[PDB]
UniProtKB/Swiss-Prot annotation:
<protein>
    <recommendedName>
        <fullName>Histone deacetylase 7</fullName>
    </recommendedName>
</protein>
<feature type="binding site">
    <location>
        <position position="101"/>
    </location>
    <ligand>
        <name>Zn(2+)</name>
    </ligand>
</feature>
<comment type="function">
    <text>Responsible for the deacetylation of lysine residues on the N-terminal part of the core histones (H2A, H2B, H3 and H4). Histone deacetylation gives a tag for epigenetic repression and plays an important role in transcriptional regulation, cell cycle progression and developmental events. Histone deacetylases act via the formation of large multiprotein complexes. Involved in muscle maturation by repressing transcription of myocyte enhancer factors such as MEF2A, MEF2B and MEF2C. During muscle differentiation, it shuttles into the cytoplasm, allowing the expression of myocyte enhancer factors.</text>
</comment>
<feature type="site" description="Contributes to catalysis">
    <location>
        <position position="326"/>
    </location>
</feature>
<feature type="binding site">
    <location>
        <position position="19"/>
    </location>
    <ligand>
        <name>Zn(2+)</name>
    </ligand>
</feature>
<comment type="subunit">
    <text>Interacts with HDAC1, HDAC2, HDAC3, HDAC4, HDAC5, NCOR1, NCOR2, SIN3A, SIN3B, RBBP4, RBBP7, MTA1L1, SAP30 and MBD3. Interacts with KAT5 and EDNRA. Interacts with the 14-3-3 protein YWHAE, MEF2A, MEF2B and MEF2C. Interacts with ZMYND15. Interacts with KDM5B. Interacts with PML. Interacts with FOXP3. Interacts with RARA.</text>
</comment>
<feature type="binding site">
    <location>
        <position position="27"/>
    </location>
    <ligand>
        <name>Zn(2+)</name>
    </ligand>
</feature>
<feature type="binding site">
    <location>
        <position position="21"/>
    </location>
    <ligand>
        <name>Zn(2+)</name>
    </ligand>
</feature>
<feature type="region of interest" description="Histone deacetylase">
    <location>
        <begin position="1"/>
        <end position="348"/>
    </location>
</feature>
<comment type="similarity">
    <text>Belongs to the histone deacetylase family. HD type 2 subfamily.</text>
</comment>
<feature type="active site">
    <location>
        <position position="153"/>
    </location>
</feature>
<feature type="modified residue" description="Phosphoserine">
    <location>
        <position position="81"/>
    </location>
</feature>
Amino acid sequence: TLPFTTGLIYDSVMLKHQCSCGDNSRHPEHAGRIQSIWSRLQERGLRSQCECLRGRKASLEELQSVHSERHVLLYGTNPLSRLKLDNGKLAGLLAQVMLPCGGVGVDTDTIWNELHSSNAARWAAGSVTDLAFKVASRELKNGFAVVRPPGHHADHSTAMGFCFFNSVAIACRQLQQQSKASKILIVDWDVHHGNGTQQTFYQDPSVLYISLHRHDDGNFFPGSGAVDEVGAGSGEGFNVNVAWAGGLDPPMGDPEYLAAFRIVVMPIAREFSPDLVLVSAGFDAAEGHPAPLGGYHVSAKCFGYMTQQLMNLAGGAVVLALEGGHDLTAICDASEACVAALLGNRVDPLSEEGWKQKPNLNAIRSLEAVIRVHSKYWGCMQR
Ligand SMILES: [K+]
Ligand SMILES: [K+]
Ligand SMILES: [Zn+2]
Ligand SMILES: [Zn+2]
C-alpha cells in the first residue's frame, strides 16, 4: 500500500476564530477542538504517515460557487482590505449583532471575530477544496481535513449554526468544475442535518447527499431534513435524509448507525457509483454529548468502521472534513479512528460485543420510512 497517499490539512490560522469575550465556556465551537485533534494525531504516530498540508484561503470566486455575492463580501472580506472592489459594492457594505457576552455575532451562537473570523472561515473552505483536488487528480488516495469553523449549516446567503461558508459544498462544486460530469456523494454523519448542503444540491442529480441526523419530527436543530425531502426537478431522488425519529430513549448508537450503513448508505451509494466521496464528519453523535448537543452514543471504532466502508467506494477517493462535535476526548478518539482507517487499518466488526445487538425499534421505524420513500428512486430500496 503506497505511502503518503493520505492527506491531512491543518493550520493555526483556524485557531484565531474566537469570540472577543475570551471564554470557551459559552462558545462550544472553540479553537481547542482542532488543536487537541491535531496533537492526538501526532502522539499516536499518524501524522508522520500522511502528506500534511497547511491549506490556504478560498478565493471569493470559489466561495461564490455556492454562496451569494452579498454573503461572500459580508463574511469573506475585511474592513479595510487591500481589495480592489468597486464603489457600488463598497457602498453596499456601508448599508449593512451584539451577544450577551459583549462580542459581535451573526446570531446568538455564531460568533464573529472582527480581525480573524473571515480568514479562518475562508481558510477552512480552501483547505477542504485543496485536499479534495489532490484526491480528484489521483495524487493522493483519500484524506482528512482538520478544520473550523464548520460548514454544513451555511446556505446560499445564510450563516447559522457556527458556520459561515459551506466548505464541503464548495469543494464539491470546485471538483466538478475541474472534472466534467463527475458524480459526487456527500455523506453527512454529523448529528445535525446539513441544511445548507441539502439546499445547495437539491435540484442537482450530479451530487448525491445522504445525511444521518437526529430529527425527532422537526424538533432538533435545525428543524430541517425530513425523510420525504428527496430533491426536486432533475435532482429528485438524490437527497437522502436518514431522519432519526423518536428521541434519546431508547439509546441511539452503534447498532443504529451500522444498520443505517448496511441498509441505506452503502447500497444507495454503490448504485449511485460516485467518482468521489466527501464526508461531513461531525462527531457530535459521539458519546460525550448531553441531550441538547446530541444525546447519542456512537463510538470511535464505529466512526472508524463507517470511514472504512466508504473507502470501498469511488476507487477509494474519500475526503473527510470536520464539522460539529465538541467533547475533546470523543472528537479526538473519533478523529484517530477515522485517520487509521484512511491509512488502511481494518476494524474487526467481531471485536465488539455491543455490535451483536439489534438496532432499536425507533431506528428500524426511521429506516423503514427511508426505504418506503426511496423505493421510488433506488433499486436496492425496491421491496
Ligand atoms: K447529518
Ligand atoms: K443532489
Ligand atoms: Zn463571547
Ligand atoms: Zn452538528
